[PDB]
From Swiss-Prot, chains A, B:
Origin species: Bacillus subtilis (strain 168)
Protein name in UniProt: Uncharacterized protein YqjZ
InterPro entries recorded: ABM_dom (IPR007138), Dimeric_a/b-barrel (IPR011008), Jasmonate_Hydroxylase-like (IPR052936)
Pfam family membership, one: ABM
Ranges where the ABM domain occurs: 11-78
Length: 89, 89
């Protein structure tokens, strides 16, 4: 349920780090989920407003057709994932 | 305070996504902070155990001397950040 079950690297990750000043954070998510090349999303938001949401994508090009069909502070970083290790017990 | 003030890409990011089963999550952090090439860290952990911690590093090599001097589920992904956009109001 929480961890995104991603394919073998490489794949991309969009790290959205935010500090809050809603219904619509969740529309913005159905939309990601719906896109071609969308691999999954991990979203977490603490009490005090601090939050990190990472979305995984299959290609730089898949991220552009998403930004295309489309906070006290935030940072958006897009990165190319070359390594992963998954664990559950 | 929350957002890491990172240099111009490229730089690396270590995305640690975890689901909890402590004092020592915080030792593991002083240590990151202390390393050569450590650029910063954003850590967030919700009530229910879900959590994302991303650490930023200047080089793949800076991450190896860290893993070197060194959960119901977790995922560790290392990625190369090629883009960033920072915002605050």
């Amino acid at each position: 349920d929480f961890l995104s079950k991603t394919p073998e690297p490489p794949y991309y990750a969009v790290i959205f780090s935010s500090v809050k000043s809603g219904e619509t954070a969740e529309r913005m998510v159905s939309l990601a989920a719906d896109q071609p090349g969308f691999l999954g999303v991990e979203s977490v938001r603490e009490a005090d407003g601090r939050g990190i949401t990472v979305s995984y994508w299959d290609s730089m090009d898949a991220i552009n057709h998403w930004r295309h069909h489309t906070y006290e502070s935030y940072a958006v970083r897009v990165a190319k994932v070359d390594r992963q290790r998954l664990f559950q017990e």
